[PDB]
Each structure stands twice: as C-alpha cells, then as structure tokens.
C-alpha cells in the first residue's frame, strides 16, 4: 500500500475489507463472498480510536 | 428474488402459502321476568281498568 495516492485509496475501496461473519456469537472469519463485506477505515488510517 | 454475481449462491424460486383460523366468542345476557307480568300478560279478568 505503498503507492501513490489514487491508486492506494481505490486499492482501499476495492480489497482492504475484513470479511467477518454475523452468525456466531465470536468473530470467526467468514466464508468467502456468501454476505457482504466488512469495510474499515482504520485499515486506511493505521491508527485505532 | 435477484440475480446474483458470480460465485454466490444464488436463490431458488420459491413459494410460501400460509393459513388464517376464524376464532369464536360468543356473548350473551340473562334477563328476568316474574309470575307476575307473565299471569299477566295474556290473561283478562272482568275487563275493569
């Protein structure tokens, strides 16, 4: 993620996503593409809250 | 349903019929009439007033 900043900011809305499951009461990670997607903006920021 | 994309499991074309149950509730009042208006509702004696 190192690149320039139009090419890193579409690679942010297109793949940097978590992928996590609602059906079990922990967070597993969820099997591919069956439910929508989990977008973090903390993954674009680095930083926590 | 919709269309899905690629790779997803897709819906199935499916139906659902479903009953509806009439529920009873019956009313009523009791009222009272004495031997009196009833030996007298019918009944005449020496037509006095």
């Given at each position: 993620?190192?690149?320039?900043?139009f090419?890193?900011?579409?690679?942010?809305?297109?793949?940097?996503?978590?992928?996590?499951?609602?059906?079990?009461?922990t967070?597993?990670?969820?099997?591919?593409?069956?439910?929508?997607?989990?977008?973090?903006?903390?993954?674009?920021?680095?930083?926590?809250? | 349903?919709?269309?899905?994309?690629?790779?997803?499991?897709?819906?199935?074309?499916?139906?659902?019929?479903?009953?509806?149950?009439?529920?009873?509730?019956?009313?009523?009042?009791?009222?009272?009439?004495?031997?009196?208006?009833?030996?007298?509702?019918?009944?005449?004696?020496?037509?006095?007033?």
């Amino acid at each position: 993620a190192n690149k320039t900043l139009f090419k890193t900011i579409d690679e942010y809305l297109l793949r940097a996503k978590d992928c996590i499951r609602g059906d079990t009461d922990t967070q597993y990670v969820c099997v591919e593409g069956t439910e929508q997607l989990i977008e973090n903006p903390c993954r674009l920021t680095q930083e926590a809250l | 349903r919709v269309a899905s994309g690629a790779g997803l499991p897709t819906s199935r074309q499916t139906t659902i019929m479903v009953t509806k149950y009439s529920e009873k509730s019956p009313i009523t009042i009791p009222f009272e009439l004495s031997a009196a208006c009833l030996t007298y509702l019918r009944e005449t004696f020496e037509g006095t007033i």
